[PDB]
Amino acid sequence: GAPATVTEQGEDITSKKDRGVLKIVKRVGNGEETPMIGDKVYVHYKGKLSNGKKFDSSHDRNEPFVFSLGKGQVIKAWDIGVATMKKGEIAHLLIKPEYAYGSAGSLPKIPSNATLFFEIELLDFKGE
Ligand SMILES: COc1cc2cc(c1OC)OCCCOC/C=C/C[C@@H](C)OC(=O)[C@@H]1CCCCN1C(=O)[C@H]2C1CCCCC1
Fold first, then answer.
1. What ligand 1 atom has the least distance to the C-alpha of 106?
2. Whose CA is nearest to atom 30 of ligand 1?
3. CB contact burial 95-113 (16+ within 10 A = b; e otherwise)
4. Distance (Å) from CA 114 to ligand 1 centroid
5. Which parts of the sequence belong to the PPIase FKBP-type domain?
6. Which stretches within the chain are classed as H helix?
7. From ligand 1's centre to the CA of 15, what distance in Å?
8. 48 lines ligand 1 (CB under 6 A)
């Protein structure tokens, strides 16, 4: 599966290099420019828990997901991962609980020590 490809071949994009966020680019985006901290960011995504028990998509809501990069408005893995993406790119992220919801989790939706996979498409990013 898509997760196992990332676990195998996938780029370690953490600063500490602890394999905590792993990345494969699936469709290459456009321009040399990736977003700066603070940028307003527009994505579509699909996401799941590795346990296969929960799934979530921006499409279930019929619209892009929007947030300010690097404000901790998402999990650390998104602030890291999306910062590496070009306009128009689709990537896969596989994420250790340390860069998601950790030992506490976020019950009931996310258990203690959960691993998460996302597919992300970066639609646009505008400046603060
Ligand atoms: C544990 O809570 C949730 C987790 C996730 C989605 C949740 C959610 O309920 C608040 O609602 C769906 C719409 C997003 O609501 C706005 C804020 C999200 C920010 C924050 C909670 O999440 C994140 O940063 C990440 C990345 C951005 C997309 C959502 N994501 C999630 O962790 C998903 C999660 C993904 C795995 C399957 C279950 C849901």
1. 1
2. 74
3. bbbbbbbbeeeeeeebbee
4. 13
5. 30-118
6. 2-9, 76-82
7. 24
8. yes
- Of all protein residues, the one whose alpha carbon is nearest to atom 18 of ligand 1 is 74
The dihedral built from the CA positions of residue 68, 71, 72 and 77, taken in this order, carries a sign that is: positive
* Sequential DSSP letters for 91-109: EEEEE-GGGTTTTT-BTTT
* Separation between Cα atoms, residue 40 and residue 126, nearest integer Å: 5
Q: Are 30 and 86 in contact (CB under 8 A)?
A: yes
d(CA 116, CA 33) in angstroms, rounded, equals 27
DSSP state of 100: T
**Method used experimentally:** X-ray
Q: Which two tokens stand for residue 127?
A: 């400046």
Which residue is listed with tokens 């400046």? 127
Q: What does DSSP say about strands 11-12 and 90-95: parallel, antiparallel, or unpaired? A: unpaired
Q: Which residue numbers are catalytic?
A: 45, 55-56, 75, 101, 118
| Nearest-angstrom CA–CA distance, 64 and 75 | 17
Residue 57 is given by DSSP the state E
Q: Reported resolution in A?
A: 2.5
